[PDB]
C-alpha cells in the first residue's frame with residue numbers, strides 16, 4: 814500500500830519473548846537504535862526510548878503483561894513483540910491485542926533483532942506504517 818505520513822511513535826513498548834541469553838540487552842538496544850534511525854529517515858519516527866522493555870516466557874505471560882501495559886502507560890501506541898521462531902506466543906499476542914484489549918502489536922523474529930539489515934528494518938517500518946496508518 815501507499816506510505817502514510819504524519820505518524821510519530823512516542824510511546825511504545827518492547828516485549829521480548831526470546832530468551833535473554835539468545836537476544837541480549839545490547840541486541841535489543843542496537844536494534845532499537847537502527848530502527849529509530851531508519852524510521853526517522855522515512856518520516857515515521859519511532860522514539861529511541863521505549864516506555865517499557867521486558868523479557869517474558871510463554872503464551873500465558875502475554876495477557877497479564879499486556880493488561881499491565883494498558884493499565885500503566887497512557888498513550889501507548891505500539892507493542893513490539895520479539896519472537897523466537899515459530900511459537901504459539903504469536904497467536905496469543907494477536908488474540909489479546911486485536912481481540913481483547915485493542916492494542917496494536919508488531920511482531921518481529923529474534924534473528925532480525927540479533928542482526929539487523931536495512932531491508933529487514935524497512936520491512937518492519939512498512940508493517941508498522943500500515944498498522945498505525947489508517
Ligand SMILES: O=c1ccn([C@@H]2O[C@H](COP(=O)(O)O)[C@@H](O)[C@H]2O)c(=O)[nH]1
Pocket residue numbers: 896897898899900901903918919920921922923940
Ligand atoms: O510463530 C510465529 C508467527 C509470526 N512471527 C513473525 O511475526 C511477524 C509479523 O507480525 P505481525 O505483522 O502480524 O505483527 C513476522 O515477520 C513473522 O515471521 C514469528 O516470529 N513466529
